[PDB]
Amino acid sequence: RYRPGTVALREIRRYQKSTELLIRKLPFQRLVREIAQDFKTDLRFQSSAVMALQEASEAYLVALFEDTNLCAIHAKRVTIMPKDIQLARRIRGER
Amino acid sequence: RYRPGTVALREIRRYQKSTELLIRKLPFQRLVREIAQDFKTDLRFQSSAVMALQEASEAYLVALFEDTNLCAIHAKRVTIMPKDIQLARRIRGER
Amino acid sequence: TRKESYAIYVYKVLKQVHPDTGISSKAMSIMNSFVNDVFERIAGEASRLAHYNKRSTITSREIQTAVRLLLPGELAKHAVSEGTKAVTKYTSA
Amino acid sequence: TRKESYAIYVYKVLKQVHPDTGISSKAMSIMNSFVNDVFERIAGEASRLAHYNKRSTITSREIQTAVRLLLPGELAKHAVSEGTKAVTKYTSA
Amino acid sequence: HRKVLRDNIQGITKPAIRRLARRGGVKRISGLIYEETRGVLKVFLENVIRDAVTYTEHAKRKTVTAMDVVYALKRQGRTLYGFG
Amino acid sequence: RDNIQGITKPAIRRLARRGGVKRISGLIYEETRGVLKVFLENVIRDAVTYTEHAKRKTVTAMDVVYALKRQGRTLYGFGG
Amino acid sequence: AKAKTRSSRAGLQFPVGRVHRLLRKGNYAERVGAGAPVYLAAVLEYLTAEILELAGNAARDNKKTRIIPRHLQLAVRNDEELNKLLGRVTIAQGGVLPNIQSVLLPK
Amino acid sequence: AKAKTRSSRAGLQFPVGRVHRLLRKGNYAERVGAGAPVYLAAVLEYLTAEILELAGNAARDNKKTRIIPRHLQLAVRNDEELNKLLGRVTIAQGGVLPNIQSVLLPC
Amino acid sequence: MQIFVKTLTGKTITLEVEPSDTIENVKAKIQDKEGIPPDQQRLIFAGKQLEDGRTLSDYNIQKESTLHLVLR
Amino acid sequence: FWDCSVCTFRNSAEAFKCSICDVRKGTSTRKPRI
DNA sequence: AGAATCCCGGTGCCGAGGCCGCTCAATTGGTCGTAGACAGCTCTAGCACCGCTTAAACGCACGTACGCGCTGTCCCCCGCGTTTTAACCGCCAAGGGGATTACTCCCTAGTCTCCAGGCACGTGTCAGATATATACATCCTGTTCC
DNA sequence: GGAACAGGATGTATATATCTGACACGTGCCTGGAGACTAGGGAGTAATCCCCTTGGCGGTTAAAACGCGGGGGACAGCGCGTACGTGCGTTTAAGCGGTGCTAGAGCTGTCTACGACCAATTGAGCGGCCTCGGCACCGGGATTCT
Ligand SMILES: [Zn+2]
């Protein structure tokens, strides 16, 4: 049995050294289509379009998570919460 | 004698209800010229130029201080320390 | 020489929205810079859009699309309605 | 139709620097997008600078002030150096 | 021919958000991070999709393109490389 | 020399009070001096390069607000 | 023929002709359509009227009968969509809205 | 009349003629000077050389012969000045630099 | 005869030695006045990793020489 | 060989990263920084 | 002891790079209209100066309150195993519309003439910046009953 | 000792006087905006190829879902002592008002090299094919970390 934290650190190392996509293609595509259902109707998508969309979402979420990790350690914590999320977004300038 | 914090809040109210320049303009102008010999020697500066400079400087610093206050209170403190300064700058992306 | 600005037009708009409301010169300069900035943003976006669609003309359609891209929400909605009414009234002459 | 890109040119640069190093398609597209974006930023900056100085033409001086604006520090210094030596060679030729 | 599809944004699953946090260098995850992440992710996509479909309706097309995705991203300052 | 020290501790206190801050630490003052110095360094570098390209020796409010517009920190009220 | 300005034709207070001149002479595009300046003048007029109306209410609120950059700043920053439009915009002599944290208040 | 390309004349591998055509048809200015495309092509060649050299060094530090997006991202994020030039950039299959806050590692 | 050692954060340390002292002597002196044990020290001068058993005169280290110290 | 810029160690021609301080190679025109 | 990952060697496969065909657009050269490079002149605001006054910074002390461990707690994420589920890959078919070519038409750049709207200029006058006095809201400590 | 309250001191909105410099309004004009007409290309419109997207189905799992045990981290109360708010006296020099000189920004005449347009062309760059090696994936040790 491993102590909690070591598996997480190994996961962090592996996912930082790797570059593959982390969100399942079909669920992300269905999410994109669901969001598109509101603006227009019967929209069609290029496969590269949802691929680039997923790339953007991956990068933005990774940057936000890094920012919130910095906020959490600044608050003398190692666990993030939506208080950290909202602080990071507010100072970035989206809220 | 007022308890500490009361006069601080009165200053906050007075300076938030007011819009005049908080930086001594002659020292600010001398600082700008000091920075200015580093790029071109014997430069002539417009009074409106240094005025816009100090306006933008004051606005940027007051926004930075607002973000620092948010950082510190997220860290459950009312006193800001420079670790909040570089945290806010890193979050904003200026460093 | 002459240095043009939107002073007369901004004053006319302010008088038409407020019959008794004066304005200072510094606020007027802020208004002029604001109008120039919005003109720059909208027209630059429209020119970019025309370039990207391999089009060499800016008309009401790309102006409308640039307005929708820039302005948020009901501001964009009201601005689009105003632009369409103005274009209709102008072409109906 | 013919769709233009920078594939051959970037490949010549790669062969100049590392003779035995190959390039992939996705990285090649990233290279093309990088060259296009830098071209866009630099030339647009030159266009705005010429507009502000009430100059209707873009010259090497505008391009040089543009690179000095956009590229920081050491990049600006050596970019100006290489560009100036290229321009001197072209004018000598 | 295309039936509407509600209740799909739960497909951004907890293992996926955990993997994203692991890539971002996050050590420990609370309970509400998943709901928070899903919400902000939806908002990000919604804003992007609004810009992209505005481009598409301007182009008088019906297929949203990877080009238009990069178009909107560069509009947002989120410029993306390798896709045109 | 060292006229950044002319940016005074009461001035930093006033600016923080306008920012809505109650309690100020000691290192805040010269930390603020440093960040102000680097910000002014960047802005002045851009504005002076504008003046350089203008074939002029007088830096103008027009050039400085144009640098501000470039940096994403656009300013109104000074023309343009 | 009698002179009739394009602004009068479109029922606009903004200079349609001047907008068209800045469009062509600002080299945004090598041809500019006839309906393009009218639409741009309309949206500019609407935006200016909106922010001036908000500042007018602010001026009336503080019993001052002249618009001041402080009123302009209050008008833009108290409006969510105008604030989003002008997030990166700095207003000279604008100051900041009165805002402190409630926890910042004494207990 | 034997034709010699401007790129060959300037000692540049980048297409001076194509850059000139893009500058003209890209309507940045009413007219484009002669030295501007040469200077721009030289600058583009320099930046391409830097990025490719750094990416190739990163790849050869991984014992590989093809430069890939991971290598490009490593080069860009490992050069501080190229990072400052490329702050707002997302690279497809870029990944991230390996870095962990020291507090998270035991001592 | 003094020598100057540079660290990774730009902090410069001054040492008082003679050309006859060995490299391990310099490492022990660094440990004495700084707490950095010889096993943690990697010393560079004139593009050479100075081997512990050799002396300063072997590497032609003169007065006020520039030394680089790397910790691992 | 190439000499390092950060730790100045005599890296061989095949070393694209420094052996000890682990810094990447720079150009003959531009050298790496701290 | 047990799990994770690097080192080394085989196999495949597909796509990267080199080679052939084409075509179109970059070269060459001349012409010509003009953007600006340059010289000249003007005036204005920008630097430097002076002195005075007083607003504000410096410095000192002093209390005090809050930042920082320190501790204990407790509950809640994390690792692990089992179950299940839908993602993914490869295959199928339909057809929607993305993109392309040709025609034409009409819309805007361009030129000319005319003319009036906005800009530089000037001047009365009132919004308000400032001053004084005051009553009320805040704030704090000393005093009092439980 | 702890909660409640009165009163003194302080800060501040409120009630008026004032004098003032910017603000808004009247005016000359001239230059940029508007009316007429041309023409030639940009773009709308019709028809088509087929690229690619949508829909779907069958396995095969890698991965998601769920539940459990538990140790680790968030959180709260505590204490202290140290750093900072607050106030007061002092010292500095910032700012106001005026003067002066002039370097340099701005406007004007000129003429000239500099760059757009057009004709012919030919080679460079892009589209398509072929191959082989560089890397993905496979397995067995060996080292490293927990
Ligand atoms: Zn080294």
Side-chain angles (χ1 to χ4, degrees), chain A residues 1-2 4-94, chain B residues 1-94, chain C residues 1-2 4-25 27-93, chain D, chain E residues 4-5 7-84, chain F residues 2-80, chain G residues 1 3-24 26-106, chain H residues 1-62 64-107, chain I residues 3 8 10 12 19 22-23 28-29 35-38 40 44 46-47 49 53 57 65-66 68 70-71, chain J residues 2-9 11-13 15-32 34:
Chain A
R1 176 176 186 84
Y2 294 14
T6 297
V7 152
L9 155 72
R10 193 166 54 207
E11 293 177 350
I12 288 184
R13 291 223 281 283
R14 163 189 174 181
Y15 288 133
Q16 261 181 101
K17 183 178 179 180
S18 58
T19 203
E20 92 278 17
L21 282 190
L22 276 71
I23 311 301
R24 296 285 159 272
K25 309 299 189 68
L26 292 207
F28 190 85
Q29 177 173 169
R30 291 200 312 258
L31 173 62
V32 164
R33 296 180 185 280
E34 171 181 1
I35 293 183
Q37 285 280 355
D38 318 333
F39 303 140
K40 200 113 173 184
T41 324
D42 320 331
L43 272 182
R44 308 168 96 88
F45 280 80
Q46 291 188 332
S47 316
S48 55
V50 305
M51 273 319 77
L53 263 193
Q54 168 148 351
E55 291 325 324
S57 325
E58 291 305 20
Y60 166 70
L61 284 178
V62 164
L64 178 57
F65 275 145
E66 201 156 29
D67 283 8
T68 39
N69 189 62
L70 273 65
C71 295
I73 167 60
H74 169 79
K76 284 202 291 323
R77 291 186 266 91
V78 286
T79 314
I80 55 168
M81 315 138 273
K83 43 190 285 186
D84 286 313
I85 285 292
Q86 293 158 2
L87 172 68
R89 300 190 71 244
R90 266 285 306 103
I91 307 195
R92 274 166 137 222
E94 291 56 13
Chain B
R1 294 183 137 268
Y2 294 138
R3 313 269 309 299
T6 295
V7 201
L9 282 145
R10 293 204 285 102
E11 290 176 340
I12 287 183
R13 294 186 172 91
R14 208 162 54 74
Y15 294 129
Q16 277 193 344
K17 257 195 331 183
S18 73
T19 60
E20 61 295 6
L21 304 180
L22 309 179
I23 297 323
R24 302 285 91 190
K25 323 173 286 331
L26 258 60
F28 188 85
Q29 173 144 190
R30 290 195 308 261
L31 168 63
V32 176
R33 297 183 183 283
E34 183 178 2
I35 277 144
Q37 315 82 48
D38 293 8
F39 306 136
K40 183 68 180 295
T41 309
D42 159 7
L43 284 162
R44 281 175 126 71
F45 275 96
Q46 294 193 336
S47 61
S48 53
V50 84
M51 261 292 168
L53 267 173
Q54 171 187 292
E55 290 284 347
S57 166
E58 255 150 355
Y60 163 71
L61 280 185
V62 77
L64 176 57
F65 272 146
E66 178 49 328
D67 288 9
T68 317
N69 184 27
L70 281 187
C71 276
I73 183 92
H74 175 76
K76 64 212 81 163
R77 309 182 320 260
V78 314
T79 316
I80 61 183
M81 281 160 311
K83 60 185 187 66
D84 303 82
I85 286 318
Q86 327 85 356
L87 174 67
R89 296 187 74 233
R90 160 78 52 71
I91 275 296
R92 283 164 150 218
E94 305 192 9
Chain C
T1 84
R2 51 165 79 255
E4 321 196 320
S5 92
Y6 294 100
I8 290 323
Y9 321 104
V10 167
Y11 184 72
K12 284 178 178 177
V13 174
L14 157 52
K15 265 319 185 303
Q16 168 299 340
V17 297
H18 287 271
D20 189 59
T21 296
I23 189 175
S24 90
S25 66
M28 251 305 308
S29 181
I30 287 183
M31 271 306 88
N32 192 77
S33 295
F34 168 68
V35 172
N36 283 317
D37 178 32
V38 174
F39 173 88
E40 191 36 61
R41 298 245 271 287
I42 286 202
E45 191 46 10
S47 175
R48 232 181 320 301
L49 182 43
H51 189 25
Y52 280 91
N53 281 104
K54 326 292 291 173
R55 221 57 76 89
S56 41
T57 325
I58 329 182
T59 78
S60 54
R61 195 173 181 275
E62 328 82 338
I63 296 299
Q64 161 155 330
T65 305
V67 160
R68 292 221 280 100
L69 284 193
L70 265 296
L71 300 214
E74 71 305 346
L75 262 194
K77 196 173 315 304
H78 297 325
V80 162
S81 42
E82 285 276 81
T84 54
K85 264 172 291 303
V87 166
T88 307
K89 191 173 179 70
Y90 165 75
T91 192
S92 69
Chain D
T1 166
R2 298 292 180 85
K3 169 209 39 55
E4 311 56 11
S5 88
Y6 302 129
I8 305 308
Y9 314 108
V10 168
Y11 193 83
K12 304 312 211 153
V13 172
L14 183 59
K15 300 313 284 181
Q16 281 193 122
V17 283
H18 316 185
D20 69 333
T21 300
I23 198 43
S24 77
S25 76
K26 278 296 282 305
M28 192 66 198
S29 183
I30 289 155
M31 273 329 306
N32 187 79
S33 297
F34 165 70
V35 178
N36 274 317
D37 180 30
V38 166
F39 164 86
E40 181 46 0
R41 281 200 231 166
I42 271 176
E45 201 46 20
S47 174
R48 264 155 327 283
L49 300 214
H51 178 272
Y52 314 142
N53 295 108
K54 299 296 183 181
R55 294 301 174 90
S56 46
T57 172
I58 271 176
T59 75
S60 97
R61 194 172 183 273
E62 281 95 10
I63 291 311
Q64 142 179 330
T65 302
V67 280
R68 177 178 319 304
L69 257 286
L70 294 172
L71 301 202
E74 183 65 13
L75 281 188
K77 222 145 82 162
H78 268 113
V80 163
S81 98
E82 311 295 8
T84 36
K85 74 179 26 182
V87 169
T88 50
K89 285 177 65 69
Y90 173 65
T91 54
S92 90
Chain E
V4 291
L5 295 174
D7 189 7
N8 157 281
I9 173 50
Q10 266 311 314
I12 290 327
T13 188
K14 152 163 43 181
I17 299 177
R18 174 175 295 271
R19 287 192 302 273
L20 281 183
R22 290 293 187 265
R23 173 165 283 182
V26 177
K27 185 33 161 53
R28 212 157 181 269
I29 295 288
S30 177
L32 311 93
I33 322 300
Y34 315 113
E35 297 335 325
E36 183 61 61
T37 303
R38 290 173 185 119
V40 57
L41 178 57
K42 199 289 180 188
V43 170
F44 172 86
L45 263 300
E46 181 187 301
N47 289 337
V48 175
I49 297 331
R50 173 246 303 288
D51 284 16
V53 305
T54 300
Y55 275 119
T56 308
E57 311 155 50
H58 177 82
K60 320 211 159 62
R61 297 186 334 242
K62 299 178 187 300
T63 51
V64 152
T65 59
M67 274 324 305
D68 295 333
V69 152
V70 195
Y71 271 54
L73 286 208
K74 174 152 61 73
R75 257 282 325 290
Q76 274 193 49
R78 290 291 183 288
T79 180
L80 157 55
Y81 276 53
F83 279 116
Chain F
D2 66 53
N3 289 337
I4 175 49
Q5 293 311 358
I7 281 315
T8 41
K9 193 219 62 158
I12 306 312
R13 287 188 77 90
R14 283 195 292 271
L15 242 186
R17 288 295 185 268
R18 180 171 288 180
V21 200
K22 184 152 151 193
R23 209 157 175 266
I24 288 329
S25 178
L27 329 181
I28 296 295
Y29 310 117
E30 72 313 352
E31 181 46 20
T32 295
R33 290 188 186 102
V35 52
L36 179 53
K37 204 202 60 61
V38 57
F39 170 76
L40 281 193
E41 221 177 71
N42 261 26
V43 172
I44 284 323
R45 194 161 31 61
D46 283 18
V48 166
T49 300
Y50 271 117
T51 308
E52 209 63 90
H53 182 82
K55 288 289 213 324
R56 287 198 326 256
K57 271 162 320 296
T58 304
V59 177
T60 72
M62 202 37 49
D63 318 318
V64 80
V65 63
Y66 269 88
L68 271 43
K69 164 192 271 273
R70 274 201 61 270
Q71 259 194 50
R73 215 72 50 64
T74 185
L75 167 66
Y76 288 6
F78 288 88
Chain G
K4 182 177 305 315
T5 69
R6 306 233 289 281
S7 294
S8 62
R9 304 259 301 286
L12 287 185
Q13 298 279 40
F14 259 62
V16 175
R18 181 174 296 185
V19 167
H20 193 193
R21 190 199 78 219
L22 311 185
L23 279 180
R24 295 174 341 293
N27 289 284
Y28 299 59
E30 183 280 335
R31 299 161 95 264
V32 156
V38 168
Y39 207 110
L40 191 44
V43 51
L44 284 180
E45 161 177 291
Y46 167 68
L47 288 179
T48 284
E50 191 46 15
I51 165 175
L52 283 184
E53 161 56 350
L54 292 170
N57 311 305
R60 180 183 61 241
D61 196 2
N62 192 31
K63 292 182 292 297
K64 291 178 169 301
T65 74
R66 183 167 298 145
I67 293 268
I68 189 65
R70 172 62 166 188
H71 300 153
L72 287 182
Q73 169 83 328
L74 293 181
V76 47
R77 301 306 173 181
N78 277 119
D79 171 309
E80 201 186 60
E81 51 285 20
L82 274 179
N83 174 65
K84 274 163 51 43
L85 175 65
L86 300 194
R88 321 318 311 290
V89 162
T90 295
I91 285 313
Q93 323 303 359
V96 64
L97 318 90
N99 173 52
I100 89 176
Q101 293 54 20
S102 208
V103 46
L104 254 287
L105 287 166
Chain H
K2 179 62 173 171
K4 204 180 194 298
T5 83
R6 280 187 278 182
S7 297
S8 59
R9 293 184 185 272
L12 298 181
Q13 313 289 20
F14 257 87
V16 174
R18 174 174 300 190
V19 172
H20 200 316
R21 183 201 84 210
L22 289 174
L23 282 184
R24 287 205 185 120
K25 292 342 310 194
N27 64 342
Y28 302 59
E30 161 56 352
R31 50 169 64 194
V32 166
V38 163
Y39 209 68
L40 185 44
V43 170
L44 294 192
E45 192 142 319
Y46 183 13
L47 290 192
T48 308
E50 293 298 300
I51 277 304
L52 288 195
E53 171 156 50
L54 293 199
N57 290 2
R60 299 290 289 279
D61 273 304
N62 287 2
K64 290 178 180 296
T65 85
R66 289 171 195 151
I67 286 174
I68 88 163
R70 174 63 167 180
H71 296 140
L72 285 173
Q73 175 86 336
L74 270 276
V76 166
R77 303 315 169 183
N78 296 132
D79 186 278
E80 183 178 2
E81 275 227 92
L82 283 169
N83 206 311
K84 254 193 81 183
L85 174 59
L86 300 188
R88 338 324 301 290
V89 201
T90 290
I91 285 186
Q93 288 76 328
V96 284
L97 290 198
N99 54 317
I100 311 166
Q101 283 313 70
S102 302
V103 57
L104 299 194
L105 305 318
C107 295
Chain I
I3 59 137
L8 297 194
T12 304
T22 193
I23 308 311
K29 289 168 144 268
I36 306 161
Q40 300 180 14
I44 308 297
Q49 186 62 253
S57 61
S65 275
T66 300
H68 286 181
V70 152
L71 71 165
Chain J
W2 64 277
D3 219 342
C4 170
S5 64
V6 155
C7 89
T8 72
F9 177 80
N11 288 275
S12 272
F16 297 99
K17 85 173 303 192
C18 192
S19 297
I20 295 100
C21 70
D22 302 302
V23 301
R24 293 178 179 83
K25 214 147 87 169
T27 83
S28 65
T29 62
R30 171 230 291 176
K31 62 180 59 60
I34 313 299

